[PDB]
Amino acid sequence: SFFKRLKDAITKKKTTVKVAWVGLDYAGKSTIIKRITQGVFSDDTKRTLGLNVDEFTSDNIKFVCWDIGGQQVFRDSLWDAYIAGSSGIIYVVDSAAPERFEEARTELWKWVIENSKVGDIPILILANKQDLPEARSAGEVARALDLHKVLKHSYAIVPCSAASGFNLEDALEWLRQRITEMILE
Numbered sequence: 001s002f003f004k005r006l007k008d009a010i011t012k013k014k015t016t017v018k019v020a021w022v023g024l025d026y027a028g029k030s031t032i033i034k035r036i037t038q039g040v041f042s043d044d045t046k047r048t049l050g051l052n053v054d055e056f057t058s059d060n061i062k063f064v065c066w067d068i069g070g071q072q073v074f075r076d077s078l079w080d081a082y083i084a085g086s087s088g089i090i091y092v093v094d095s096a097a098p099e100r101f102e103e104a105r106t107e108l109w110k111w112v113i114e115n116s117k118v119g120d121i122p123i124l125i126l127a128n129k130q131d132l133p134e135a136r137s138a139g140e141v142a143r144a145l146d147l148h149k150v151l152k153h154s155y156a157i158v159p160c161s162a163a164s165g166f167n168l169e170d171a172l173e174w175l176r177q178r179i180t181e182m183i184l185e
């Protein structure tokens, strides 16, 4: 698991980690968090912090799931309050919902890319719901998000399915390694 490997890495470093999970509503974030944490971070374990923010903790690991876009407005106050202190950011996209790609691109650049606060923080993009027949490729989503324009951040886009498990732990190992090296630095 990524959950178990992250816990052991940060316990060996003798410190604490925070992982942010941002992305539009119905993208798959709560589903991925429940699955990757083998149940530990279920809906009946979420300390609710805001109208769209949920928070999880288990010893030295903390996860911050935030449903972005929609009616919710990005305020720099809310970012300091909820996401500031994160060591990695996970942007989740529903590849079978191309109608909302316009919105996911605008929120990714609003909250993460053109965010002075997010620095060398590894940003992992999950092109989720690949099992659906309408799912666009990971490269289609990368072009939709103008990732080809992201010149100053350390990112990675990996296609995955939260229902089948496909590529999930593999994408998360890239982030786990990127967090492990930069932690305490």
Ligand SMILES: Nc1nc2c(ncn2[C@@H]2O[C@H](COP(=O)(O)OP(=O)(O)O)[C@@H](O)[C@H]2O)c(=O)[nH]1
Pocket (backbone or CB within 6 Å): 024, 025, 026, 027, 028, 029, 030, 031, 032, 067, 128, 129, 130, 131, 132, 160, 161, 162, 163, 164
């Ligand atoms: N078929 C399929 N459905 C998914 C997948 N990921 C999430 N879903 C469904 O889409 C909904 C969105 O998940 P959830 O994490 O609760 O929404 P969010 O927290 O707003 O992203 C859930 O009810 C899941 O049943 C996937 O990979 N495949």
Ligand SMILES: [Mg+2]
Pocket (backbone or CB within 6 Å): 029, 030, 067
């Ligand atoms: Mg949710």
